[PDB]
Amino acid sequence: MLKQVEIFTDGSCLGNPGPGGYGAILRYRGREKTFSAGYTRTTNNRMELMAAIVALEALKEHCEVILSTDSQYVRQGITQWIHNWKKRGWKTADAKPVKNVDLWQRLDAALGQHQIKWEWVKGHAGHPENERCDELARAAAMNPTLEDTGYQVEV
């Protein structure tokens, strides 16, 4: 039985906007939980954030997590954006709400319940779980069943 929660995530989308999906694998307690769903009209970026959201929200107590993903967008948000956005009240320099504020706020709330170690993998050098994420993400996008409520051509 692992002593650290392990999460792997991926998101995919066929257009901008277009049908997209996510795949997330979670090794929690003594199980391997697999999440995956497709959305009718969304973006690659929103799917990559959704992956991480759904895996963390599945956690019911404070855990020590290791999250592995090749997502550049999640990476930039976490290492260069988030800290600064919290200080500015989640606004851009032209005073508007940041893009995908809905999801970043949601991610942010899930993050602050845990001790997280981020593992930035390269697309072509991930583990077998990251490849599975990708395959699930892709399949989900081909058969969308949910609405991505927070999406805007806008704000």
From Swiss-Prot:
Enzyme class name: hydrolase
Binding site residues for Mg(2+) 1: 10, 48, 70
GO molecular function, one term: nucleic acid binding
Free-text comment on the cofactor: Binds 1 Mg(2+) ion per subunit in the absence of substrate. Requires millimolar levels of Mg(2+) for maximal activity. Has low activity at micromolar concentrations of Mn(2+) and is inhibited at higher Mn(2+) levels. Can bind a second metal ion at a regulatory site, or after substrate binding.
Domain RNase H type-1, chain residue ranges per copy: 1-142
Outcome following mutation: residue 134 to A: Loss of activity
GO biological-process terms attached to the record: DNA replication, removal of RNA primer
Residues annotated for Mg(2+) 2 binding in this entry: 10, 134
Listed EC numbers: 3.1.26.4
The keyword Magnesium belongs to this UniProt entry's keyword annotation: yes
One GO cellular component, as annotated: cytoplasm
Cofactor dependence: Mg(2+)
Effect of deleting the gene: In a strain that encodes a retron, the msDNA is abnormally sized.
PROSITE patterns assigned to the protein according to its UniProt record, in alphabetical order: RNASE_H_1 (PS50879)
Catalytic activity: Endonucleolytic cleavage to 5'-phosphomonoester
Subcellular location: Cytoplasm
Subunit structure: Monomer.
Function statement: Endonuclease that specifically degrades the RNA of RNA-DNA hybrids. RNase H participates in DNA replication; it helps to specify the origin of genomic replication by suppressing initiation at origins other than the oriC locus; along with the 5'-3' exonuclease of pol1, it removes RNA primers from the Okazaki fragments of lagging strand synthesis; and it defines the origin of replication for ColE1-type plasmids by specific cleavage of an RNA preprimer. Involved in production of retron derived msDNA (a branched RNA linked by a 2',5'-phosphodiester bond to a single-stranded DNA).
Family: Belongs to the RNase H family.
Name of the protein in question: Ribonuclease HI
Chain's gene name: rnhA
